[PDB]
Amino acid sequence: ELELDEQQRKRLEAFLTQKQKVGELKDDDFEKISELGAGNGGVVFKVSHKPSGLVMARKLIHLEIKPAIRNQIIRELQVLHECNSPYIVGFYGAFYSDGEISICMEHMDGGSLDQVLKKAGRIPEQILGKVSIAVIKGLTYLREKHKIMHRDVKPSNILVNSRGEIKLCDFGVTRSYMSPERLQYSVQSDIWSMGLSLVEMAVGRYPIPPPDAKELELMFGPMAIFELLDYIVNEPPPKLPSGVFSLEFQDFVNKCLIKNPAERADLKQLMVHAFIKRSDAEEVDFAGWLCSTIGLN
Amino acid sequence: LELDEQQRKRLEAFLTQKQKVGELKDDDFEKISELGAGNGGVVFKVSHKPSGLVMARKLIHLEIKPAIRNQIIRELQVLHECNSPYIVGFYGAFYSDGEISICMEHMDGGSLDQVLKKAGRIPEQILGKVSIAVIKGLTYLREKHKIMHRDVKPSNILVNSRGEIKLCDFGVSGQLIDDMANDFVGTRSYMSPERLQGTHYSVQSDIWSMGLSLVEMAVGRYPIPPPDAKELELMFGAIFELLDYIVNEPPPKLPSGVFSLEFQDFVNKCLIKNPAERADLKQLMVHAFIKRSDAEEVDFAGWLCSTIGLN
Ligand SMILES: Nc1ncnc2c1ncn2[C@@H]1O[C@H](COP(=O)(O)OP(=O)(O)NP(=O)(O)O)[C@@H](O)[C@H]1O
Ligand SMILES: Nc1ncnc2c1ncn2[C@@H]1O[C@H](COP(=O)(O)OP(=O)(O)NP(=O)(O)O)[C@@H](O)[C@H]1O
Numbered sequence: 001e002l003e004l005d006e007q008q009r010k011r012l013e014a015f016l017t018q019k020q021k022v023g024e025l026k027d028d029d030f031e032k033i034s035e036l037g038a039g040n041g042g043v044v045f046k047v048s049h050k051p052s053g054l055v056m057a058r059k060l061i062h063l064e065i066k067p068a069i070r071n072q073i074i075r076e077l078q079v080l081h082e083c084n085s086p087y088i089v090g091f092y093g094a095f096y097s098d099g100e101i102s103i104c105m106e107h108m109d110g111g112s113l114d115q116v117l118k119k120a121g122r123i124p125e126q127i128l129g130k131v132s133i134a135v136i137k138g139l140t141y142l143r144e145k146h147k148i149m150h151r152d153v154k155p156s157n158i159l160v161n162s163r164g165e166i167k168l169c170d171f172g173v174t175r176s177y178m179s180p181e182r183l184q185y186s187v188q189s190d191i192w193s194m195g196l197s198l199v200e201m202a203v204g205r206y207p208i209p210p211p212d213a214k215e216l217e218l219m220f221g222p223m224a225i226f227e228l229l230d231y232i233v234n235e236p237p238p239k240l241p242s243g244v245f246s247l248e249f250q251d252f253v254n255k256c257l258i259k260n261p262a263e264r265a266d267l268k269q270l271m272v273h274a275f276i277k278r279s280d281a282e283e284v285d286f287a288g289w290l291c292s293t294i295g296l297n
Numbered sequence: 298l299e300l301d302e303q304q305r306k307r308l309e310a311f312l313t314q315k316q317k318v319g320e321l322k323d324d325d326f327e328k329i330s331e332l333g334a335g336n337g338g339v340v341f342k343v344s345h346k347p348s349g350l351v352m353a354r355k356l357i358h359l360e361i362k363p364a365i366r367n368q369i370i371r372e373l374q375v376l377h378e379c380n381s382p383y384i385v386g387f388y389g390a391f392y393s394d395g396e397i398s399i400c401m402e403h404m405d406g407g408s409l410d411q412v413l414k415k416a417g418r419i420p421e422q423i424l425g426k427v428s429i430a431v432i433k434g435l436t437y438l439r440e441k442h443k444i445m446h447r448d449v450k451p452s453n454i455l456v457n458s459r460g461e462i463k464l465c466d467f468g469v470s471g472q473l474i475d476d477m478a479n480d481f482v483g484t485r486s487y488m489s490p491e492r493l494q495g496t497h498y499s500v501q502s503d504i505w506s507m508g509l510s511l512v513e514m515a516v517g518r519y520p521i522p523p524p525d526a527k528e529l530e531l532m533f534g535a536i537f538e539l540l541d542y543i544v545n546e547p548p549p550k551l552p553s554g555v556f557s558l559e560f561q562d563f564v565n566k567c568l569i570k571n572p573a574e575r576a577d578l579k580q581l582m583v584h585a586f587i588k589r590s591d592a593e594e595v596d597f598a599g600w601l602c603s604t605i606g607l608n
C-alpha cells in the first residue's frame with residue numbers, strides 16, 4: 001500500500017514552505033561549499049543560496065548546444081516542481097546561465113548508494129529491502145501520477161540521508177535507412193535497472209559478467225563498454241548467489257531481471273511480492289546502519 | 298564462408314604491412330586528396346612517410362577531456378581491429394590536436410553511393426556480389442559481437458579495383474554516445490536488454506538496410522517515397538513524412554519484369570516489416586538469389602573501373 005504516512009506529509013509540507021521561501025534562482029545567489037561528486041556530464045556541488053540561507057545540491061550540466069533544444073529542456077524541466085513525493089529528491093528549480101544548465105535540489109547528507117557501497121563492501125539484505133520499496137514507490141509515483149519514467153535508475157541515482165530517507169534523483173530529461181522496428185524501453189526497463197542495482201549492492205560487485213566460484217569465495221566463503229553492452233543483450237541475466245540470501249529476495253531480483261520485458265515483473269506485481277511484504281513489515285534502523293557505514297553521529 | 302588460400306594470404310599480407318607503420322603520429326601523414334564525407338568526419342587519402350603506405354584517414358573532430366582519452370582510444374582500437382576480408386583493414390587510431398584519426402586501407406573504388414552516381418543504376422549481377430559480401434560481412438560481426446555499432450547503407454560499402462567489396466569503419470559517434478550514457482570508467486551499464494537492443498544496430502535491422510540499399514542502387518533512386526507508374530516507365534521501358542511513410546504505408550519492392558524473380562524475392566525477404574519474420578543471414582546465405590550470385594562469374598573490377606574511370 002502507498003499513501004502519505006502522517007510523519008511523511010509533515011516533511012513534504014516542511015519542504016514546500018522552505019521552497020516557497022526561495023522563488024527565483026540565478027548564478028550570483030549561490031556560493032559553492034564542497035564537491036559532492038561527479039559523473040559523465042554535470043559535476044555536483046554542495047552550495048548555499050544566500051537569499052534563503054538554505055543548503056542545496058547543484059548539478060551543473062554542460063550544454064553549449066542549440067538554443068531551441070535548450071529552452072525546450074528548461075521548459076519541460078519545470079514540471080518537476082509538481083513532482084513531490086517522499087521517494088523523489090526535493091526539487092527547487094532549474095535554470096540556464098553561463099552556457100550550463102543547472103539543477104538545484106535538496107542536498108542529501110548520505111550521498112548516493114554508489115558511494116555508500118564503496119564504504120560498506122556489501123549492503124545487507126534488510127537494508128536493500130528498504131531500498132527496493134523506496135524506488136518501487138518512486139517509480140509508481142512518477143508513473144501513475146506524472147506518466148514520467150526515470151530512464152536512469154542505478155546506484156548513483158539512489159540518494160540517502162541521515163533521516164533514513166531514500167530518494168530518487170536524475171529524473172531529468174530524404175535519406176534514412178533505419179528499420180521501421182527501430183524508427184518507433186518502459187517502466188519495465190527501469191525495473192531491470194533496479195534488479196541489477198540490487199544485485200550489485202548485494203554482492204558488492206557489478207554482476208556482469210558473473211564470477212566463477214573462484215572469485216566468489218573471496219566474497220562469501222577486463223572488457224570494453226561495447227563487449228559489455230553486447231553481453232547484456234545476448235547472455236543470460238545475473239542472479240544473487242544462493243545460500244547467502246533469502247529465497248524471497250533471490251526470487252524478487254529474478255522477476256526484475258527476466259531478459260524478456262514482456263514476461264518480466266511489473267511495479268504492481270512487485271509491490272506485493274513476498275520479499276516486499278516482509279520488507280515493509282520489518283523495522284530496520286536504516287539511519288543507524290547508514291551513519292555508521294559512512295561516519296556521521 | 299571460411300576457405301580461400303588467397304583470402305588468407307591477402308589478410309596475412311595486410312597484417313604484415315600493418316605493423317610497419319609502427320606508431321602513428323600527425324606529422325607522419327601527407328594529405329594527398331579528399332575521398333568523401335559522412336555524419337562522422339571527413340576522409341582524406343594520405344601518404345604515410347615512415348612506410349610509404351597510402352591510407353584513408355578519417356578525422357573525427359570531437360574534443361575529449363585528456364583524462365578519459367587513452368581509455369576511449371583503446372576501446373576504439375579493440376573495436377576496430379577486425380580481421381575479415383569483408384571489413385576494410387584497420388591500421389590504427391590516435392588523437393592529435395582535438396581530433397581522433399582512424400587510419401584505414403584505401404579502397405580505390407570509393408563507396409557505393411559514389412559508384413551509384415557514376416553508374417545511374419547498378420546491374421543485378423553486380424548487386425548479387427555486393428549482396429554476398431555484405432551478408433558475409435555482417436555474419437563475421439555477429440560472430441564477434443561488434444554488430445551493434447554497424448549500420449548498412451550505400452555510403453558504408455566500399456569497393457576496389459581488385460574486385461573486393463567491404464563494409465567500412467565504425468561510426469565512432471555511437472561508441473562515444475555509449476561511453477557517456479553509461480559508467481565509462483567502471484565499465485558498468487544499467488540499461489535493459491530491450492533498451493540496448495533497440496537503440497543500437499542489429500543484424501535484423503541491418504538486413505532491412507541492405508534490402509533498402511539494394512532497391513536504391515537497382516532503380517537509381519532512394520525508393521521510400523515509391524516511384525509511381527510515370528517514373529517506372531521513364532527509367533526502363535518532406536523530412537518527417539519519410540519516417541512516417543516508412544512505418545505506415547507498405548515496403549518498397551523492385552519493379553517487375555526488369556529484375557529476376559530470385560532478386561525480387563530476396564529484397565522482399567529483407568524488407569518485411571516484422572524483424573522476426575524478415576530473414577536472417579542463415580536463410581539469406583542459402584536463398585536462390587545468393588546461390589545464383591555465388592555461382593556466376595562476374596567481372597566486377599572491370600565494371601567498376603569502367604564505371605568510375607581507373608587506369
Ligand atoms: N542532491 C544530491 N545530494 C547529495 N549528493 C548528490 C546529489 N546529487 C548528486 N549527488 C552526488 O553526486 C554524484 C554525481 O551525480 P551525477 O552527476 O548525477 O552522476 P551520475 O549519477 O554518476 N550520472 P547521471 O547518469 O548523470 O546521474 C552522485 O554520486 C551523488 O552521490
Ligand atoms: N577506406 C576508405 N577508402 C576510400 N574511401 C573511403 C574510405 N572510408 C570512407 N571513405 C569515403 O568517405 C565517406 C566517409 O563516411 P563513412 O566512413 O561512412 O563515415 P562514418 O562516420 O563511418 N559513417 P556515416 O558518417 O554515417 O557516413 C564514405 O562514404 C566513402 O565515400
Ligand SMILES: [Mg+2]
Nearest residue numbers: 156157169170
Ligand atoms: Mg546522478
